[PDB]
Design a protein around this ligand. Structure first.
Ligand SMILES: COC1=C(OC)C(=O)C(C/C=C(\C)CC/C=C(\C)CC/C=C(\C)CC/C=C(\C)CC/C=C(\C)CC/C=C(\C)CC/C=C(\C)CCC=C(C)C)=C(C)C1=O
Ligand code: SF4
Ligand code: SF4
Ligand code: SF4
Ligand code: SF4
Ligand code: SF4
Ligand code: SF4
Ligand code: FES
Ligand SMILES: [Ca+2]
Lengths: 120, 588, 905, 198
């Protein structure tokens, strides 16, 4: 959701991203880049992530010929599935309305009561 | 009263003794969370106070630490003397099992203190580092030169107005320093290093560094030799200076933990433990018992890893090469367990303020059982193949021996101090992290700290750590892995993912940082190579105002010339192999 | 007064409540519904402390510290266990319905509710039931609305209605369904609605313009700057990220603009991020353009200017004092000309002469709120100097404050003060050509032409003092209303006379000066305020120089062949055809500017000047206070091809390359010393800020927060090798985290407010000596001139009555907050807020010409006919036609002018 | 594609000369002698790769040399401290052609987590690097993977056969980045094992 918590939690400062928003109001990263020549694989970004988006996976074979190619953009990071957390969805919890979830449709949320309602 | 509560320690008998000797208005007692009495002494009374402490009925025999502090940006200095800078002296009385921290206040222009080297000889390197990083002059010092930075360095990096970040790289300065390196071999002046009698026309001068093909790191020693006899030796250290304390002033309390990992890089969770304990003292957090047992088990696993590396490296330094292969196989078993628990091998960064990062994974006990069944036969085989060999005994026994007095006067801790016969282990004398609930022994020497005696003491420490791991495996509480304190950083992840209050706490803790109220805290632990301590000053902010790390390898490297003078060069290599140091621990 | 907090004795003001007294002492009490500018109401119940009856009391009683006076001998406890439990419970009650929104909420990291949740130590949720939800409203282009996050602290409605005087915001519904917003979807009509994003402690009201390009507060690079969009001089904190200006926060100045901006300053920054901005020097060869670096541009421009026979300069009230002075040094004082028109210059120098030779004190913007009668002559204050209108609203509420003080009601108990002073208010008399936004609180509104407004002012002055010149031919009803004004002003203990140059009449300013002199001669404590047009109008008036028409005649006669134009769109101050002719005739036109102006197609050289975000300088507000603005970011950090320098740096380098054939750029303090050495009337700008060698215990002042992130990845797509930190040799600020931003640091320039545990705009409490007062070591900025010992004489040139003429339509100015300031019109978010340009007609004149509302009429000005649709204006008197000044095609110089051949299209 | 040093050029490569140059490259890539150089923790994982549980000797790259004259590969495994940077430069200059460089760990790659006053931000500030390994530390098998990447780079390069006959330019293959090569399989990953188990 491009909340920028992982970038500020990174002690090396090797995460850079910018928030964009869809038409229905869903936040997402416009870009997301990680300088892996700086990254110490400490896992503080995964710990800080409130959506379980960013994850450290069992893969060590990341050797490279050019150091510029260790800058991984969003196309090199976004995978096809949920990874280590198969079911969590932050947008099922958030009160912010997106496509497919109007106000009052999140978890533990009541339907909105308009102030012009006849009930006391 | 909790163990993290702020105390003035006015009921310490040393405060009454100082009252009786120097009067009540001669000093100011400061209430801290360091756990030791902190006394602000006038500069002109420092030598008298130190001599009085040295001449007590149960005396303060060891200068544990000596360093400086830039107090100019410290907003919360209530009940403190006016000071632009300060110098602190941490002294340990072994017989009392007590400490005291003397503090001398200094103005910005009058930045000179009388030297402490006549009372404690380890004050030489400590005052050289204080002069190097703070610009504080010590009057009467034999050679007050820079020890961390190169001699042609401008400024003092631990001052608050010094910028922490790396400057722009210039190849011109690199070529100038290369020319300095290649001209130093031709224009060596044996007076600027504290040496005397610079060629009797028989003293050959050799260099051992600045590159060393070993795991303890790369460093330079200048040797003055008469034939094969070392008549003088001065070290050149600071070749692995990483600015870890300055970085402590730059990272938040949470984001500094991976930096604590890389102080003594064979120690891992052992290195993390004193930092998180000191931060929890600042936060007022008492961790639950399962956290204590988890941290103890991780620290003992990493202690076994480090001791196996040390014993194998010593055997390789003697001349037998196969036990390092087998000890690295055992290290791979330990790394299998540590990888399973923390997800990393060497720098797990797994301890947290108020607990650990995750719960233990399902099935960790099977891997611990496999390691505990694998280890003892291998250790016995190592002993029978290499440690009982008479060639190794001839290389090790009687080499670089010192007694209790020399160990105390140089701040020697760990296996060397216990090999001198002094029974001082932090896990028993000043217990931490629930170590009192474990049944284990502290091996001590007969009175002579040899290379062989230190190695065998480390072998018995490995066996005791195996005993602690067996008790950890058999007795695990089924509780939380994180304390329920609001300053537990980060909060438990599932509550963060579904509760807004926990989400808010997590948001502010990982971004701006946890707010530690203004205090000073201290924690020393028995590390793999001696006593490792963190001294943290919070000015009320989300980062440390001052992070001071005392490491034992610094003291052991400073003790090197006192124990090796008059010996052979091969004895110096064996002594270097038997110290159990790393240069990252030395330079920080 | 003596209070005892947790066993510690403190000396406080007895007229303060306990919350503000304790926050002034550095103690931390959580609070939501209290604000320093709004007073106390006791809604949120967050500020609970335990009050004891005396020293030997142990039970105590929980009280609200915001509603409890800090009287002598008070005994309270903040850290009492019951008080801490209740404050945590209040946080918990607010958290029961709060949405799980912090990652996708624009307030995160800047949220007062987050900070107080952490401060109370509440982190465990035991509530398990459903959360109430709300639908959101569309509130216009600036403010985004999210009512789920509301904690019902009532700050928004109290600020918007009671403080700002807005009418379209309110609280609706009942018990836990209280809803804060508008009665229906629509744009917030207040000119000060943008302060809601800082007033609201949660993420209900958010900066939508920031939300388009959102980033967190810790990721911003801040600088202390001055708002450029009018002459008031409100202190701002521009914050940038990734090379673009992201946000304008209010920067607290206890003397100027304390907590509040206007919406023009807060949201009219978007021109800085325009893609058509000049990034590098461009020189045209034939019909093609080539890009030069700065050294080649200096060498070529110096060679061509050296070949020329006479170089003249055209400054701008947009540009700073340093850049205008550097232009005046490059071309010479006798060849320097101000970029404003002749009549505009005459009105500006008359306003300056009244300000610094009239012998009557000119108050600062905060000081306006203490005057007990206000007469506004000609100046549509809300659309031109909006923060002055806000201050005048507070000064009007001063009467309710006085009646509440008579009944021994504390000055912070705002509900009691409003109840006592029901609708009683200090007298406000506004005059304009039409209705103003101050009419809802004005005791009287005079809709008349500018000469009739001046005649009213001269008649008021003559009725206050018989030595003032008389006005002959006053109607009895107008005479009775004049007597009402005179009786209100004479009995006032502190009258304030506000005027300005926007009315477009010299006699209005003279009438205001005569009223001020007549009130001064009766021993009253009269203040006078002038409203200039642009950010450095008063600085250009103090520097002086010939008018733009003199420079146009120099370029048209041909005796000047080279012209430098600094930060000036010349079509605003002169007719476009004459400017285009004089610039097409000129063999050398050089334009130093930061925006793509219309005179850059006839410009032979264009220099990429820096905007205020990328430059340092000094600007003079209409109070006469010199204020220093600082560079926010280095434009060459992300795009290394960008050659965008300070204007004074460009012009000084040009003068150096002209004289010694060598390129020396300059330092800022050298230009400051040059200004104060050549110009003694601008000698105060040396003391506006400390020089670039200023340190806080040896270290510079930081521009970015401590947790500034992404430093090894924000440029990693360009190159993985990190560039050097930008160097600031100009000022005492560093372009990095390696600096000082302590609230106790001995400085007056604060780039942003942050304290540990206070991440919201409430950290300005920590940056103050007392909360709601001034900054701890004084507000920045110094006054250039003091009050003169002797005043002026009465201006005897009373203008005649306005007579309508057939075929001659006198242009009445209609300024707009969104549209009359050039750079703010260039901001893309102001196009949605842009009113459609309607020409205003009297019903009688429109009936005579046979045009209804909405019909297009074409009028001819300067030999060019343009068509605008008709809006019927009842208050506009006959013989006048209403035009929106400063818009696209309608220059502000057209105010007070006549118009010919207005025909139906 | 190739890079020329003495410029982006094409492949210069008779049928006997090409085969014998391939045999030269095969002998160079199957006989790599690393230099013994301990900087920091990354060196501990490097010598872990040398031990029995990993056995990097299988690749023929176990011959650790204390002399730079007999070493073909320099593995910068550790932080480039400002005092150690002239030492690293002198040791690199003491090596003989052909010489290859592997940066091991984030410190050697970029400075890593030590953007500090006493640390050079990456060894490529002053020494050319052929293979970079991210990690802090990289595990020993990552060092072995970088060794294989170095062998692929060596087997595709063209060096002067003799100093008296032929072109003396050094040709280095501009290989495809490993990120773009593995993007096909890395993005297709859907489900990973949950961190609760072992
Ligand atoms: C760090 O530990 C060490 C190693 O790693 C296991 C070594 O491989 C080595 C290198 C030694 C060996 C591989 C065994 C001796 C055989 C060698 C060098 C083979 C050389 C063969 C030729 C030149 C024939 C052509 C040393 C010295 C060492 O100390
Ligand atoms: S794992 Fe890498 S990217 Fe994530 S916080 Fe640590 S250093 Fe930064
Ligand atoms: S990866 Fe997670 S922590 Fe980082 S911006 Fe995205 S949602 Fe936030
Ligand atoms: S208003 Fe504050 S507490 Fe609520 S979702 Fe936004 S950042 Fe979180
Ligand atoms: S919308 Fe904001 S300011 Fe208004 S009552 Fe709710 S939380 Fe308070
Ligand atoms: S009143 Fe003027 S100076 Fe103040 S914010 Fe508005 S436009 Fe800017
Ligand atoms: S990259 Fe990490 S493991 Fe390697 S030398 Fe640096 S701190 Fe040590
Ligand atoms: S701040 Fe006092 S009750 Fe709200
Ligand atoms: Ca500048």
């Amino acid at each position: 959701v491009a909340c920028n918590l992982c970038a500020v939690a990174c002690p090396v400062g090797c995460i850079s991203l910018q928030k964009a928003e869809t038409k229905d109001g869903r936040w997402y990263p416009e870009f997301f880049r990680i300088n892996f020549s700086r990254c110490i694989f400490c896992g503080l970004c995964e710990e800080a992530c409130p959506t379980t988006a960013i994850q450290l996976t069992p893969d060590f074979e990341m050797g490279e010929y050019k150091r510029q190619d260790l800058v991984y953009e969003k196309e090199d990071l976004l995978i096809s599935g949920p990874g280590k957390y198969p079911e969590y969805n932050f947008y099922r919890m958030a009160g912010m309305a997106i496509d497919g979830k109007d106000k009052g449709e999140a978890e533990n949320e009541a339907k909105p009561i308009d102030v012009k309602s006849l009930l006391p | 009263e909790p163990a993290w509560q702020t105390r003035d320690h006015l009921d310490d008998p040393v405060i009454g003794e100082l009252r009786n000797r120097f009067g009540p208005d001669a000093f100011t007692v400061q209430a801290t969370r360091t756990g030791v009495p902190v006394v602000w002494i006038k500069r002109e009374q420092l030598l008298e106070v130190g001599d009085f402490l040295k001449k007590l009925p149960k005396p303060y025999v060891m200068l544990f630490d000596l360093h400086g502090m830039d107090e100019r940006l410290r907003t919360h200095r209530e009940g403190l003397p006016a000071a632009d800078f300060s110098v602190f002296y941490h002294l340990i009385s072994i017989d009392r099992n007590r400490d005291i921290m003397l503090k001398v206040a200094l103005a910005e222009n009058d930045l000179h203190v009388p030297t402490f080297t006549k009372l404690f000889p380890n004050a030489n390197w400590y005052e050289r580092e204080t002069w190097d990083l703070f610009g504080i002059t010590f009057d009467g010092h034999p050679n007050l030169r820079r020890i961390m930075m190169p001699q042609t360095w401008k400024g003092h990096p631990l001052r608050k107005d010094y910028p922490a970040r790396a400057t722009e790289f210039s190849p011109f300065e690199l070529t100038k320093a290369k020319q300095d390196l290649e001209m130093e071999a031709l224009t060596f002046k044996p007076e600027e290093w504290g040496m005397k009698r610079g060629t009797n026309e028989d003293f050959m001068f050799l260099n051992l560094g600045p590159n060393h093909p070993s795991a303890h790191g790369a460093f330079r020693i200048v040797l003055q030799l008469d034939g094969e006899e070392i008549v003088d030796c001065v070290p050149d250290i600071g070749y692995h200076h990483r600015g870890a304390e300055k970085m402590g002033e730059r990272q938040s309390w949470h984001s500094y933990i991976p930096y604590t990992d890389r102080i003594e890089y064979l120690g891992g969770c052992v290195n993390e433990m004193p930092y998180v304990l000191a931060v929890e003292k600042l936060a007022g957090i008492t961790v639950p018992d399962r956290v204590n047992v988890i941290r103890v088990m991780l620290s003992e696993l990493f202690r076994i890893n480090s001791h196996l590396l040390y014993i194998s490296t010593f055997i390789q330094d003697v001349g037998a090469m196969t036990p390092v292969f087998f000890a690295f196989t055992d290290r791979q078993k330990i790394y299998d367990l540590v990888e399973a628990i923390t997800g990393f091998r060497m720098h797990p960064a797994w301890f947290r303020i108020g607990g650990v990062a995750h719960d233990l994974p399902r099935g960790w006990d099977r891997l611990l059982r496999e390691f505990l069944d694998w280890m003892p036969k291998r250790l016995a085989s190592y002993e029978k193949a290499a440690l009982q060999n008479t060639i190794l005994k001839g290389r090790s026994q009687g080499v670089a021996a010192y007694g209790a007095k020399e160990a105390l006067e140089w701040g020697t801790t760990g296996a060397g101090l216990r090999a001198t016969g002094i029974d001082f282990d932090v896990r028993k004398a000043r217990p931490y992290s629930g170590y009192e609930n474990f049944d284990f022994e502290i091996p001590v020497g007969g009175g002579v700290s040899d290379c062989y005696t230190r190695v065998m003491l480390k072998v018995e420490e490995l066996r005791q750590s195996l005993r602690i791991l067996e008790q950890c495996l058999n007795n695990m509480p089924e509780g939380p892995f994180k304390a329920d304190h609001p300053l537990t950083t980060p909060p438990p992840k599932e509550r963060t993912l579904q509760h807004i209050e926990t989400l808010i706490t997590h948001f502010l803790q990982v971004s701006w940082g946890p707010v530690m109220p203004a205090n000073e805290s201290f924690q020393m632990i028995e590390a793999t190579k001696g006593i490792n301590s963190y001294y943290l000053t919070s000015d009320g902010s989300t980062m440390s105002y001052r992070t001071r790390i005392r490491t034992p390898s610094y003291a052991h490297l400073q003790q090197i010339p006192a124990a090796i003078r008059g010996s052979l060069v091969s004895d110096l290599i064996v002594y270097l192999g038997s110290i159990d140091f790393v240069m990252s621990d030395v330079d920080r | 007064a003596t209070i005892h907090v947790d066993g510690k004795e403190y000396e406080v003001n007895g007229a303060d409540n306990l919350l503000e007294a304790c926050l002034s002492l550095g103690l931390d009490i959580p609070y939501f519904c209290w604000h320093p500018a709004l007073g106390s109401v006791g809604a949120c119940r967050q500020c609970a402390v335990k009050q004891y009856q005396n020293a030997e009391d142990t039970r105590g009683r929980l009280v609200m510290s915001c509603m409890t006076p800090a009287s002598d001998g008070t005994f309270i406890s903040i850290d009492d266990e019951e008080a801490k439990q209740f404050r945590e419970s209040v946080v918990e009650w607010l958290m029961t319905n709060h949405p799980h929104d912090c990652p996708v909420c624009e307030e995160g990291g800047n949220c007062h509710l987050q900070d107080m949740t952490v401060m109370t130590g509440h982190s465990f949720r035991r509530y398990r039931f459903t959360k109430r939800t709300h639908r959101n409203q569309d509130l216009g282009p600036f403010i985004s609305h999210e009512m789920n996050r509301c904690i019902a602290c009532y700050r928004c409605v109290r600020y918007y209605k009671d403080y700002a005087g807005g009418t379209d915001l309110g609280v609706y519904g009942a018990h836990d369904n209280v809803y804060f917003g508008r009665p229906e979807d629509g744009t917030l009509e207040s000119e000060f609605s943008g302060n809601l994003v800082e007033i609201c402690p949660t993420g209900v009201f958010t900066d939508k313009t920031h939300s388009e390009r959102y980033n967190r507060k810790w990721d911003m690079q801040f600088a202390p700057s001055i708002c450029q969009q009018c002459s008031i001089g409100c202190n701002i904190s521009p914050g940038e990220r990734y090379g673009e200006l992201r946000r304008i926060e209010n920067r607290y100045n206890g003397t100027v603009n304390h907590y509040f901006l206007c919406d023009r300053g807060r949201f009219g920054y978007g021109y800085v991020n325009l893609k058509d901005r000049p990034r590098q020097p461009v020189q045209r060869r034939g019909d093609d353009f080539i890009t030069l670096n700065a050294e080649q541009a200096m060498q070529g421009a110096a060679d061509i200017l050296r070949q020329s026979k006479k170089v003249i300069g055209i400054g701008s009230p947009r540009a700073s004092v340093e850049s205008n002075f550097a232009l005046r040094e490059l071309v010479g004082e006798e060849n320097f000309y101000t970029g404003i028109a002749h009549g505009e210059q005459e009105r500006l120098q008359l306003a300056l002469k009244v300000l610094r030779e009239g012998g009557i004190y000119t108050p600062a913007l905060r000081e306006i709120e203490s005057y007990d009668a206000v007469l506004v002559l000609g100046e549509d204050v809300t659309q031109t100097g909006a923060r002055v209108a806000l201050a005048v609203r507070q000064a009007v509420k001063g009467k309710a404050r006085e009646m509440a003080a008579a009944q021994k009601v504390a000055d912070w108990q705002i509900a009691a003060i409003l109840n006592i002073g029901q609708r009683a208010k200090h007298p406000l008399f506004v005059t304009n050509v039409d209705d103003t936004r101050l009419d809802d609180i004005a005791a009287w509104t005079y809709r008349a032409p500018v000469e009739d407004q001046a005649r009213l002012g001269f008649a008021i002055a003559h009725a206050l003092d018989n030595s003032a010149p008389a006005v002959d031919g006053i109607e009895p009803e107008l005479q009775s209303k004049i007597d009402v004004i005179v009786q209100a002003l004479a009995g006032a203990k502190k009258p304030l006379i506000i005027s300005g140059t926007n009315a477009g009449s010299l006699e209005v300013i003279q009438a205001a000066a005569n009223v001020a002199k007549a009130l001064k001669g009766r021993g009253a404590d009269v203040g006078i305020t002038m409203i200039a047009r642009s950010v450095n109008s008063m600085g250009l008036g103090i520097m002086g120089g010939g008018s733009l028409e003199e420079a146009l005649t120099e370029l048209e006669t041909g005796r000047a062949d080279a012209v430098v134009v600094l930060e000036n769109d010349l079509h605003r101050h002169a007719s476009a055809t004459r400017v285009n002719a004089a610039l097409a005739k000129a063999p050398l036109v050089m334009v130093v500017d930061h925006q793509r102006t219309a005179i850059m197609e006839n410009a032979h050289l264009v220099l990429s000047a820096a905007s205020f975000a990328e430059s340092d300088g000094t600007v003079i507000n209409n109070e006469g206070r010199a204020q220093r603005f600082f560079q926010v970011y280095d434009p060459a950090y992300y795009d290394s091809k960008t050659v965008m320098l300070e204007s004074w740096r460009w012009l000084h380098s040009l003068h150096s390359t002209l004289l010694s054939r060598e390129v020396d750029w300059t330092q800022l303090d050298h230009v400051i010393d040059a200004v104060v050495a050549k110009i003694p009337e601008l000698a105060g700008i040396k003391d506006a800020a400390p020089d670039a060698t200023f340190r806080i215990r040896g270290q510079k002042l930081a521009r970015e927060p401590h947790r500034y992130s992404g430093r090894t990845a924000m440029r990693a797509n360009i190159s993985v090798h990190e560039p050097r930190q930008p160097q600031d040799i100009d000022t005492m600020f560093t372009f990095s985290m390696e600096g000082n931003n302590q609230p106790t640091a001995h400085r007056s320039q604060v780039p942003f407010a942050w304290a540990p545990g206070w991440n919201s705009p409430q950290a300005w409490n920590k940056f103050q000596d007392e909360v709601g007062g001034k900054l701890r070591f004084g507000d920045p900025g110094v006054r250039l001139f003091e009050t003169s010992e002797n005043g002026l004489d009465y201006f005897t040139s009373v203008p005649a009555r306005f007579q309508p003429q057939d075929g001659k339509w006198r242009i009445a100015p209609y300024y707009h907050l969104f549209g009359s300031d050039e750079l703010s019109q260039r901001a893309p978010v102001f196009q949605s807020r842009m009113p459609q340009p309607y020409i205003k007609l009297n019903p009688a004149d429109a009936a005579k010409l046979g045009v209804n509302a909405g019909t297009r009429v074409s009028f001819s000005y300067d030999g060019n006919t343009v068509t605008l649709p008709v809006e019927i204006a009842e208050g506009l008197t006959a013989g006048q036609v209403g035009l929106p000044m400063g818009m696209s095609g309608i220059a502000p110089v057209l105010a007070g002018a006549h118009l010919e051949d207005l025909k139906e299209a | 594609d190739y890079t020329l040093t003495r410029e982006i050029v094409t492949d210069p490569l008779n049928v006997f000369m090409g085969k014998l140059n391939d045999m030269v490259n095969w002998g160079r890539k199957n006989s790599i002698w690393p230099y013994n150089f301990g900087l920091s923790c990354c060196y501990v994982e490097m010598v872990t790769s040398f031990t029995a549980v990993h056995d990097v000797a299988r690749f023929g790259a176990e011959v650790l040399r204390a002399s730079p004259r007999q070493a073909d590969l320099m593995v910068v495994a550790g932080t480039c401290f400002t005092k150690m940077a002239p030492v690293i430069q002198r040791l690199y200059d003491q090596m003989l052609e052909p010489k290859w460089v592997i940066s091991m760990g984030a410190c050697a790659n970029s400075g890593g987590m030590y953007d500090i006053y006493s640390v050079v931000q990456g060894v490529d500030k002053f020494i050319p690097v052929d293979v970079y390994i991210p990690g802090c530390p990289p595990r020993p098998e990552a060092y072995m993977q970088a060794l294989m990447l170095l062998q692929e780079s060596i087997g595709k390069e063209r060096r002067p056969l003799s100093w008296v006959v032929g072109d003396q330019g050094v040709y280095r293959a501009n290989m495809q980045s490993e990120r773009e090569r593995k993007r096909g399989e890395r993005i297709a990953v859907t489900n990973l094992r949950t961190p609760d188990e072992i």
